[PDB]
Write an enzyme that holds these catalytic residues in place. Sequence first.
Site, short mmCIF file in Angstrom:
data_model
loop_
_atom_site.label_atom_id
_atom_site.label_comp_id
_atom_site.label_asym_id
_atom_site.label_seq_id
_atom_site.Cartn_x
_atom_site.Cartn_y
_atom_site.Cartn_z
N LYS D 11 2.12 2.56 -1.27
CA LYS D 11 2.72 1.83 -0.17
C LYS D 11 4.08 1.25 -0.56
CE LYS D 11 -1.44 1.00 2.39
NZ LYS D 11 -2.21 0.02 3.21
N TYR D 51 -2.40 6.13 11.27
CA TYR D 51 -3.31 5.01 11.49
C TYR D 51 -3.87 5.01 12.91
CZ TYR D 51 -1.95 2.69 7.11
OH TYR D 51 -1.79 2.38 5.79
N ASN D 114 -1.47 -4.33 0.03
CA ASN D 114 -2.51 -3.81 -0.84
C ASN D 114 -2.10 -2.48 -1.47
OD1 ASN D 114 -2.74 -2.16 1.44
ND2 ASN D 114 -4.93 -2.52 1.74
N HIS D 117 -2.74 3.59 -0.36
CA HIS D 117 -3.61 4.15 0.67
C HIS D 117 -4.43 5.33 0.13
CE1 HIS D 117 -4.97 5.74 4.58
NE2 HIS D 117 -4.73 6.91 4.02
N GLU D 128 -4.95 13.91 7.32
CA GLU D 128 -3.80 13.19 6.76
C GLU D 128 -2.95 14.12 5.88
OE1 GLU D 128 -5.60 9.92 4.81
OE2 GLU D 128 -6.08 8.88 6.67
#
Lengths: 151, 151, 151, 151, 151, 151
Positions: D11, D51, D114, D117, D128
């Site tokens: 991320k 998402y 966080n 992913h 994905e």
Amino acid sequence: MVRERTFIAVKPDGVQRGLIGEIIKRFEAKGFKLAGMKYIQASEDLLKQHYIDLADKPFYPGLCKYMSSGPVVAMCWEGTGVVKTARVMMGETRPADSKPGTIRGDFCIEVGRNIIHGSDSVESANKEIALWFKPEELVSWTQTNESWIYE
Amino acid sequence: MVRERTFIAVKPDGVQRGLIGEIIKRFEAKGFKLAGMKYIQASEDLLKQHYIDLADKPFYPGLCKYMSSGPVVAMCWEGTGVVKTARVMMGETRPADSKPGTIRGDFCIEVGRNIIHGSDSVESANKEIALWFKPEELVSWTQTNESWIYE
Amino acid sequence: MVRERTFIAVKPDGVQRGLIGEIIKRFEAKGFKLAGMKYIQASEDLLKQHYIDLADKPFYPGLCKYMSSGPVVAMCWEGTGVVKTARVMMGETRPADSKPGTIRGDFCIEVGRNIIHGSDSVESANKEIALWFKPEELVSWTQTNESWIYE
Amino acid sequence: MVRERTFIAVKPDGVQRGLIGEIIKRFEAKGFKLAGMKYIQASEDLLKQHYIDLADKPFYPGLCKYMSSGPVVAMCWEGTGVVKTARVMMGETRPADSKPGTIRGDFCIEVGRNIIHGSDSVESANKEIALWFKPEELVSWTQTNESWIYE
Amino acid sequence: MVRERTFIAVKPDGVQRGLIGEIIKRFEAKGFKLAGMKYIQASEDLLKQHYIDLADKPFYPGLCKYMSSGPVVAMCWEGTGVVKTARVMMGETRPADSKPGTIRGDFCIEVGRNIIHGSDSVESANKEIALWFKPEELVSWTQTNESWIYE
Amino acid sequence: MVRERTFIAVKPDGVQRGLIGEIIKRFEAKGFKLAGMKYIQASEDLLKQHYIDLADKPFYPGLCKYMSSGPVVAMCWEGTGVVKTARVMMGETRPADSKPGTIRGDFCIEVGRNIIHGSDSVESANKEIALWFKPEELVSWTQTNESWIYE
Ligand SMILES: Nc1ccn([C@H]2C[C@H](O)[C@@H](COP(=O)(O)OP(=O)(O)O)O2)c(=O)n1
Ligand SMILES: Nc1ccn([C@H]2C[C@H](O)[C@@H](COP(=O)(O)OP(=O)(O)O)O2)c(=O)n1
Ligand SMILES: Nc1ccn([C@H]2C[C@H](O)[C@@H](COP(=O)(O)OP(=O)(O)O)O2)c(=O)n1
Ligand SMILES: Nc1ccn([C@H]2C[C@H](O)[C@@H](COP(=O)(O)OP(=O)(O)O)O2)c(=O)n1
Ligand SMILES: Nc1ccn([C@H]2C[C@H](O)[C@@H](COP(=O)(O)OP(=O)(O)O)O2)c(=O)n1
Ligand SMILES: Nc1ccn([C@H]2C[C@H](O)[C@@H](COP(=O)(O)OP(=O)(O)O)O2)c(=O)n1
Ligand SMILES: [Mg+2]
Ligand SMILES: [Mg+2]
Ligand SMILES: [Mg+2]
Ligand SMILES: [Mg+2]
Ligand SMILES: [Mg+2]
Ligand SMILES: [Mg+2]
């Protein structure tokens, strides 16, 4: 702006075994902000106060002399949920109950030599930090990477 | 039982970039003994005295402001030849001249952002220590593995 | 503000030996900015252009087929003097002449298996960067800690 | 022989905080095979598809603009059960619930920051992987130590 | 197929200070192949022979008793130029002359406590290996990643 | 002065993948004392006895051939509760069930390639040690930091 803070100490066996940097490195890496640090050999009386809530336990007298028998690194770390999360990073009170990956899990065997201390509650942290640091010894500042740690 | 001492400080860029544990680790792994440590944001004037021999150089005013603009880890390390060996471990004043394996060599790029300070001679070290530490803040103790470091 | 850029490749022996992370880790820790990265098995023809200045050499053909026999990590790293400093971080062309602390010094033995490539000049870099990346694949962004790396 | 594949992304807070190498290092050490990797600032529209199942959620819009506000490392990792095991290696969705030893457990604090992913299922992964990589960008090769990782 | 071999020992201060794994890890990472290893407390007589060429030096008697006063890790490592390259990885005889990045550079201070031994020539290695290992205690085998280390 | 002992062996896949130092490091960092170590390619029959309680299971013949197909590091480690703690450090029999932070959790994927062995009980340990080590190959010595590990 101002987040939760806890008291962390590298115990004398941590200092003696050369684990200061390793412990600090783990907390820096997690994202917590260093607010205070000093390097001292504290008095038996100070430790008696530090562990005042355990004054009842059989191990109490020996514990306080041992924790005052040599230099410790006294620290204050800041960040969301830092009191509880620091405990997780340490493991359990007994290294035997501690997971690999935790400080006690990776580094110790016995309960009496579990190299690190952390406050067990927000309210404890307030006492311990106040016991170990004068207000002017606490540094308030902004980490540049804060906005990538906290949204 | 008392050996050579030097002053090591982690600069504000070192603190900001989470290299405190990393630096302390390297001094612990090398065999040196931590004699003093505290964590402060020092006054611009303190830094002016620290760098007094440089008051003539053009970069001086900015250096003292930058070196007082955020918290630093102030340390005193002890061991045979620690003053010169610490310099070796840091690298050169310019990170550009610092070899891989050294602190500045591994972690930074510019001379004005070179993350760590170390005394360049025994006489400089004595001055710098007296400036940043009170006498009682230097801890006298015995490391257990000393006999595996010194014959 | 866009700074000097260089081309770095993890060679197939680097990929095969699991050193991709370790190599990227070294450049991030140094302070350099990743500006480009892709993962390809490049054509023999691309490699023949990449190593064009050595097309005279006896090792050249085997070299060009080997560097195209498997996936490589193609990178562009950005920072002041990144071209020359990357070379210092790699070591010498022969691992045998590379010092400990450098990538080839720490991880390999033979010149033909020296795990990493880096441009030897600003202009070699411009040509190579142009060879491996399309302009749009070079990403413009600002690392937040930049002000602690560059003055 | 092509094995299970999953989508892993570093991320923007991962990129910004210099954890790209450390993260790749963990997957190489584990035994998984890098099959795909690219470095992009992806479009807001791509992230809205990525998402899609959370498009209901209040945190969704800010999430999709944040994940497209900066460069990310897009990866495809290959190995038996790589989808579920990657999740174990990451920790939980909230860093606060992630154990030490895991990536989110070791390196961050907040759910919105966080750093990594990973796909939550074989089919989430297929969708994905298909979303971020063109088929030709997935590289077919054989890691030499495969026979020491898989029986 | 069969490459150059040298004798490497972790001295008693290396064992005592917990550096066995760290030293082995450095040689595995470099690419060398482990051919022999055992863990023993050798006789003063064996050490007298091991250091027979220094029987002249003042430090000789004390050296041999110290090197037989505790367990050492005796090893034989294999690879191109391993005798000379192992020496480079160690540093110089004196840690004070040793660079950061080297074993002695990173870990020691004094010449009498420089944690590691290596043969100074191919011909020495043959003697030392033969002194410390029986032929049947030497393992000849093929590392699977050899073709990514040696072309 | 003599504590619990367990048998630890680095499997042929552990050796092949350069994880010997890494495993030894973890046992040194934990506080345990190395009591025995040797490096061998053992006979298929030796492995048959080592795993005698499994002679009925279908995977047994292949396991004993694989476990004798390349060199292994055979070790004996000593310390309070070392048998069970070593198991904890390894993880589960299936790497798939092993948590990050554990040896199998961090480094492998399949049950048949799980890089390390450890005795599952004190009685198993006694048998396994007697099988792999001669009595004189177990070294009796005193670690200097023991008093910082045990109170
Ligand atoms: N049986 C025991 C229990 C605790 N101690 C030591 C070790 C512990 O860290 C301190 C304080 O115990 P405490 O109950 O507060 O547990 P924590 O350290 O907060 O996890 O006392 C001991 O020496 N012997
Ligand atoms: N051209 C220069 C030279 C030094 N500085 C800064 C950065 C240096 O670390 C400090 C101290 O200068 P000094 O000559 O004592 O060098 P050291 O820090 O001891 O390596 O001054 C600078 O900003 N620009
Ligand atoms: N005698 C030689 C010289 C170079 N090579 C290989 C290994 C080198 O990395 C590449 C490129 O050689 P080059 O002279 O450009 O050296 P660098 O890679 O830039 O360090 O070719 C070889 O296999 N044998
Ligand atoms: N309450 C929440 C839940 C998720 N997010 C963010 C953080 C999460 O990584 C992404 C995706 O959420 P998701 O439920 O798919 O959890 P994972 O990323 O797969 O672990 O959205 C948030 O910011 N606040
Ligand atoms: N003045 C000295 C010189 C060497 N020693 C020790 C330490 C050295 O490693 C051994 C052998 O010395 P040697 O001349 O063979 O040097 P190397 O170990 O091969 O680098 O003797 C000592 O204890 N005091
Ligand atoms: N289904 C299985 C179970 C065990 N093995 C192998 C791999 C295991 O590590 C060894 C030993 O089996 P064991 O039940 O003693 O398990 P541990 O190694 O002690 O964790 O057998 C296998 O190949 N396939
Ligand atoms: Mg408590
Ligand atoms: Mg100066
Ligand atoms: Mg070139
Ligand atoms: Mg999801
Ligand atoms: Mg010699
Ligand atoms: Mg069993």
